[PDB]
Amino acid sequence: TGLDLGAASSFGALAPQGVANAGATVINGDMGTTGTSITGFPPGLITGQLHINDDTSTQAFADSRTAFVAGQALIATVDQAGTATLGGNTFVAGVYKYDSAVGLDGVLTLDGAGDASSVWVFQLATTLVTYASSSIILTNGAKANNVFWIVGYSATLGTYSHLEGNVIANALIAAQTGATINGALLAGSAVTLDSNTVTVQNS
């Protein structure tokens, strides 16, 4: 019960209303927009293909929204209700449902429990915020590309934070200075970046 990102699966950063970057960002992956503005490359750099307003962009965007729809349609296996904090937890495979704003301060561990095909789907009804130097850790087989952050509004990643997983946001994804991602940023409005490293993971 992982999500298929389709043509989006090679993209480190994808958004309809553009990507804005500052600083020596490195995207180990493709980057695109169905709009026409990318700013800040250079000093940002990507290793893969740039797709600005072309067929790949259109298709990748649509698959990203498809994946988003699926991520929200899954039935939760853990209901976290109003819990506001992710940090300080170890979570095995699951569809975790949170009803409002969540933050990650400290360390969230994802425990593959011995099984590499472990899947996490975080259904975050509203915002995700991670804090400065917060981190997500993988253990016992957990793979980043089997982690899905389904963000009902927008995500903000804290300065020097580290995130594992595919971030699929309904609206904005803003990565603050020095945040690093093993995963992808698939936004419904814009992606903004500052001196980030985003490294697309496979399975």
Residue numbers in the entry: 1 to 203
Task: Please give me the paper's original passages concerning this structure.
Here we present new structural data for an IBP identified from a cold-tolerant fungus, Antarctomyces psychrotrophicus (AnpIBP).
We examined such water molecules located on the crystal structures of AnpIBP and the S153Y mutants. In crystals of AnpIBP and S153Y, the asymmetric unit contained six molecules and three molecules, respectively. Mutations in S153Y and T156Y on the B-face resulted in a decrease in activity to 17% of the wild-type. There are at least 13 polygons on the IBS of AnpIBP, which are mainly located around S153 and T156. Such ice-like polygonally arranged water molecules were not identified on the solvent-exposed IBS of a mutant, S153Y, whose TH activity and ice-binding ability were lowered.
